[PDB]
C-alpha cells in the first residue's frame, strides 16, 4: 500500500480472453456455442503483424497476414507498412498522406 | 512406380527417393529446387504419420495445418511436440 | 442479396409469409422491421432495513 503513495501505478494484466464466434450454419440459423475463439487465436498472432492506433478518444488494434519471404510456397500478397495501415483501418489517401477521418 | 500405398498423398518413390510441396501438390525432389527456397522431404511411405504425430507426412510438408506450428516440424521426422514444464519465479515462506 | 434482410434469424419471406412463432408482433413481419426480444428489468417494491 506504501507502493502507491510514491505514485507506482497498479496494471490491471489480463491474459487469454475465452470466447466465442458466429457462424452461419447449414439451416440459416447462426450458432455461437462451440466456435472457440481461441482455437484460431494461436494460429493468427503466428502469422501476421500486430497494429494499434492510439486516437486519443478510443484506441483500435488489428491483424494483417506477413509474408514471410523466406517460404515460397506462401503465395500471400505482399504489403508495405503504409499499404496495410489504410486496410486496417479504412484508411483514405486525401493527397497520398493517410487520413482516418480527417485525421 | 507412381502408387500411394499408406495413401499419404505422397507415392512410395516420392517417399523412398525425395519430394517437397510445389502448389500443393507432391512433385520430385530436385538439387535446383533448394535455390528458391524448398526443402528436401522425405518419410515411410508405409505409415500414415511418420513421425507419430496426428499429423499426414503430406500435411506436415505441405504446411496445412496450424500455422503455429514451428517450421522444422513440417519435416515428416521432425515431430510436432509440445513439451510444457513450469517454472518458478517468487519463492515466499511465512508462518500464518 | 440477404437471406434475413433485417438480420433476425427469420428469413424475409418467413416474415411477410407469418409463418412462424405467431405471438410475433405483427408489424414484424415486414422484412424491414426486425423481430426482436427488449427486455428490462422493472421495480416495484423498494425495502430497507437493518438485520
Ligand atoms: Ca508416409
Ligand atoms: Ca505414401
Known sequence: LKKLDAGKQIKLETTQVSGNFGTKNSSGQIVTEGNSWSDYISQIDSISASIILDTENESYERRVTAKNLQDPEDKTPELTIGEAIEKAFGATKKDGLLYFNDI | ?96
Open chain 2, 1 to 96: 512406380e507412381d502408387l500411394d500405398t499408406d495413401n499419404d498423398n505422397i507415392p512410395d518413390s516420392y517417399e523412398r527417393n525425395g519430394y517437397t510441396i510445389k502448389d500443393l501438390i507432391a512433385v520430385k525432389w530436385e538439387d535446383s529446387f533448394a535455390e528458391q527456397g524448398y526443402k528436401k522431404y522425405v518419410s515411410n511411405y508405409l505409415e500414415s504419420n511418420t513421425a507419430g504425430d496426428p499429423y499426414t507426412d503430406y500435411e506436415k510438408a505441405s504446411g496445412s495445418f496450424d500455422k503455429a506450428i514451428k517450421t522444422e516440424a513440417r519435416d515428416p521426422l521432425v515431430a510436432a511436440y509440445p513439451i510444457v514444464g513450469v517454472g518458478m519465479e517468487k519463492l515466499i515462506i511465512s508462518t500464518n
